[PDB]
């Protein structure tokens, strides 16, 4: 796209959605295997 308003609204939205945590976000994370993706090192990958 032209990542301008798309960038700025993506940035604030991923900031909300990862602001530390949220009490049902634990399920949303395990529903996406994220606590396993941690030990896989996915946080450290450029993709």
């Amino acid at each position: 796209e032209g990542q301008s308003d798309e960038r700025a609204l993506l940035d604030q939205l991923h900031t909300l959605l990862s602001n530390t945590d949220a009490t049902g976000l634990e399920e949303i994370d395990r529903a996406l295997g994220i606590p396993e993706l941690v030990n896989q090192g996915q946080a450290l990958e450029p993709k």
Partner: protein, 59 residues
């Protein structure tokens, strides 16, 4: 939701977590999450990043 892919979720995924994940505990996050694929990947990335910054084990 075409130029920017999330400009609707800018209201609804935003209010889906601005209204806390207690009454918002369900997959209603996950159902709006999927709409902007870069937001979904940025969520998964920064979710994983927040975790390795808390509980890395070996990563």
């Amino acid at each position: 939701p075409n130029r920017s892919i999330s400009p609707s979720a800018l209201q609804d995924l935003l209010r889906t977590l601005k209204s806390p994940s207690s009454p918002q505990q369900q997959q209603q996050v996950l159902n709006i999450l999927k709409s902007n694929p870069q937001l979904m990947a940025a969520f998964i990335k920064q979710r994983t990043a927040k975790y390795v910054a808390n509980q890395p084990g070996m990563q």
